[model samples]
Target: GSMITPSCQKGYFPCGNLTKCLPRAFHCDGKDDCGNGADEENCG
Candidate 1:
């Protein structure tokens, strides 16, 4: 599985304690910072 940054409508960011990241901004460094395994989601 692959993952993209969770974005919201204008003037909004990811909501509800989810994983959020900027496209190509950060990579899954085998760490869990987004709580939802976002940073390391869809890893090989």
Candidate 2:
């Protein structure tokens, strides 16, 4: 079954398969730090 993460905090973003509710800094940094490379997305 697909895993899921809970709601992120004020400075976090739910990435990958919803398994990592992490900080926003990792996101849109032009890197695939997240398990699903979600950090490299939504970058505009």
Candidate 3:
């Protein structure tokens, strides 16, 4: 089955199709905070 899950609030990033959330500072900080690379994705 698909890994569909909940959503994250503002300033938080969703990790893949799972129920994971990370703060804004956690993402694009050169580390895999989401464990799914969702934080490092679109880090422009």
Candidate 4:
């Protein structure tokens, strides 16, 4: 299981793995920063 932090800095989203934070623009961008494939989930 993973979660997104509400306290992440603007323009950034916390990774589900709770290991790192990535830019919001990175979401659904065909990359997996969360290491759980959550970042690429539901992407177009």
Candidate 5:
């Protein structure tokens, strides 16, 4: 299922799947928190 609102707390952002909310700094940090490689996208 997908998130209808897609909300996240401060300093955090919703993953592409909208199933996980990771810290803003965690994005593009060479980690795959979204489980779909969304966090590591365009990390170069």
Candidate 6:
């Protein structure tokens, strides 16, 4: 089985392979990609 799950390009986070890579400016400040404060969601 392949471990490849697909992801966004550099300076971006994974939103969907179908969509283009979103810039870090769109995130990195505890903000959401889907607009619900999810992208910046950190794990403890």
Query: By TM-score, who's the top model here?
Result: 3
Worst 10 residues of 1 by lDDT: 19-28
Error of 6 at 20 (Å): 6.2
Which residues of candidate 4, in runs, are more than 4 Å off? Answer: 1-5, 42-44
- Residue lDDT tens for model 1, 1-44: 97665455543345334645334433545555456544555455
Per-candidate local distance difference test = 0.48, 0.68, 0.71, 0.66, 0.71, 0.55
TM-scores, one per candidate: 0.30, 0.51, 0.61, 0.50, 0.53, 0.37
Instruction: Summarize candidate 6's per-residue lDDT along 1-44 as a digit string, tens digits.
Output: 76657566677766553444556776455445555434545422
Q: Please, what are the lDDT tens digits per residue for candidate 3 over residues 1-44?
A: 77765588898857767677878787467767766655667776
Error of 4 at 34 (Å): 3.1
Flag the better candidate by TM-score, 3 or 4.
3
Ranking by TM-score: 3, 5, 2, 4, 6, 1
Q: Between the candidate structures 1 and 4, which one is better when assessed by lDDT?
A: 4
Q: Which residue pairs of candidate 3 clash?
A: none
| Model 4, span 4-39: residue lDDT tens | 445477887666556567777785676665776656
> Candidate 4: deviation at residue 20, Å?
1.1
Residue-wise lDDT of candidate 5 within 2-44, one digit each (tens)?
Answer: 6476668797877866578888788567657667666667575
Candidate 6: where is the Cα deviation over 4 Å? Answer: 1-4, 16-20
The lDDT, on a scale of 0 to 1, for candidate 2 is 0.68
| Candidate order (lDDT) | 3, 5, 2, 4, 6, 1
Full-model lDDT, candidate 1: 0.48
Tens digits of per-residue lDDT for model 2, 1-44: 97755567787877755657767677566567676666667775
Off by over 4 Å in 3: 1-6
